[PDB]
């Protein structure tokens, strides 16, 4: 269940950063 | 827009990435959106790889039981464009790497219902002109 949490974390990070090398 | 439009969009997207040439007969507007999302999920994946050593594999062994927690967790603090693209790219990973390509099985329908309900339950269509 934790390993799942690592994924959501990695996805949130990439999601948030995507937002800027696409948000520009 | 229409909830049927978004249900149609998610199903068409999953079918396309599943190589499920068990086609459709949907419209031009749905197809250009599926295309944009396919392009975005690839650009997203590329960012994920540039930052991390591993890919999704390990965390999805039990996707049939945890997918909804992953999505809930993904949008626990905030909802934006990038995370919604991560939402679709996870789904694309399941069709491309986990499930069998070229055929629309019962697990695809499970993936589809899950993503369609979550996408709609959470008003994800409001953060997307992307």
Class of domain B1-130: mainly alpha
Question: Experimental technique used?
Answer: X-ray
Tell me the C-alpha distance between A16 and A23, whole Å. 10
In this structure, what token pair is assigned to residue B96?
Answer: 């491309």
Q: Residues in chain B, how many?
A: 130
Tell me the C-alpha distance between B35 and B47, whole Å. 19
Contact B43 A11 (CB under 8 A): no
* Cβ atoms B111, B91 nearer than 8 A: yes
Tell me the C-alpha distance between B91 and B11, whole Å. 11
Q: Residue B62: helix, strand or coil by DSSP?
A: coil
Considering only the beta carbons, identify the residue of A3, A10, A18 that sits closest to B82: A18
In this structure, what token pair is assigned to residue B82?
Answer: 């990038």
In this structure, what token pair is assigned to residue A14?
Answer: 């990439």
Tell me the C-alpha distance between B20 and B100, whole Å. 10
Tell me the C-alpha distance between B115 and B95, whole Å. 13
Q: Which of B3, B9, B32 is nearest to B91 (CA)?
A: B9
Contact A12 B86 (CB under 8 A): yes
Residue spans of alpha helices (H) in chain B: 3-17, 28-51, 63-74, 81-93, 106-121
Q: Sign (positive/negative) of CA torsion B11, B71, B35, B97?
A: negative
- CA separation (Å) from B65 to A6, B6, B28, B37? 17, 24, 35, 25
Residue showing tokens 């990038």: B82
Contact B82 A17 (CB under 8 A): yes
Query: Using only C-alpha atoms, what is the Rg of chain B?
Result: 14
């Amino acid at each position: 269940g934790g390993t799942m949490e690592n994924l959501s974390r990695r996805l949130k990070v990439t999601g948030d950063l995507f937002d800027i090398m696409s948000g520009q | 827009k229409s909830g049927t439009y978004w249900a149609t969009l998610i199903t068409a997207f999953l079918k396309t990435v599943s190589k499920v040439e068990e086609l459709d007969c949907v419209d031009s507007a749905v197809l250009v959106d599926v295309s944009k999302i396919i392009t975005l999920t690839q650009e997203f994946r590329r960012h994920y790889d540039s930052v991390y050593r591993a890919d999704y594999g390990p965390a999805l062994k039990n996707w049939k039981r945890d997918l909804s927690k992953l999505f809930t967790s993904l949008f626990v603090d905030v909802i934006n464009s990038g995370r919604i693209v991560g939402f679709f790219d996870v789904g694309r990973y399941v069709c491309e790497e986990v499930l069998c390509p070229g055929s629309w099985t019962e697990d695809h329908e499970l993936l589809n219902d899950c993503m369609t309900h979550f996408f709609i339950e959470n008003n994800l269509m409001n953060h997307f002109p992307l």
